Amino acid sequence: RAVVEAPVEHAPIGKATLPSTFEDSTRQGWAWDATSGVQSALTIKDANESKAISWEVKYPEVKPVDGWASAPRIMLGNVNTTRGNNKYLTFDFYLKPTQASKGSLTISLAFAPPSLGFWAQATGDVNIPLSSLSKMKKTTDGLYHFQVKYDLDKINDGKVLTANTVLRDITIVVADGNSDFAGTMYLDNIRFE
């Protein structure tokens, strides 16, 4: 399936770069997957005083039965990197909600390793309940700041990311778990550590 929406003003793709810091005002190789349920503009915006890739999402009130159908699914294609000695992939994730009070966002990480069937998914999905947000302090520019980490030794389906396993693509999915979220999302400093 290809999810298709007319393009509008959006940031240039640039070239795949890790760490991805967006400081050149390009997407540094990040783009929607063809199957991403969100196909709206990807722009570089300031978040917490640094350039970040960003998009808006208003999830449907009627939730699809497939829990990724409505999800932003963004991917770094053809980076062809390896984790090396790094145990984690981590990034800054920011929310600027216009609505957020119930259910949760679940953030998943996957990769496309040509040695492992072009898919390997981190076991450690990260759940962000939206009722938790009210009690978090916002950045000065009014964002909720998360630093999300994935232990790359915990992968599904018995697949193993060796130090030298080539990772052709990296994918991040922000799934709506019965939430009322609407607003802006941002990623920055996507890196291994």
Residues that bind Ca ion (CB under 5 A): 21-22, 50-51, 188
Nearer to Ca ion, 28 or 39 (CB): 28
Q: State yes or no: 23 annotated in a binding site.
A: yes
Nearer to Ca ion, 50 or 78 (CB): 50
Q: What is residue 132's three-state secondary structure?
A: helix
At its nearest, how many Å lie between Ca ion and the CB of residue 188?
4
Q: State yes or no: 51 annotated in a binding site.
A: yes
Distance of CA 32 to the CA centre of its chain: 10
CA distance 22 to 49: 12
C-beta atoms surrounding 1 within 10 Å: 7
Q: State yes or no: 106 annotated in a binding site.
A: no
> Is the separation of the CB atoms in 161 and 155 below 8 Å?
yes
At its nearest, how many Å lie between Ca ion and the CB of residue 56?
19
Q: State yes or no: 90 annotated in a binding site.
A: no
Enter the DSSP assignment of 138: P
Nearer to Ca ion, 26 or 35 (CB): 26
Annotation: binding site for Ca(2+) = 21, 23, 50-51, 188
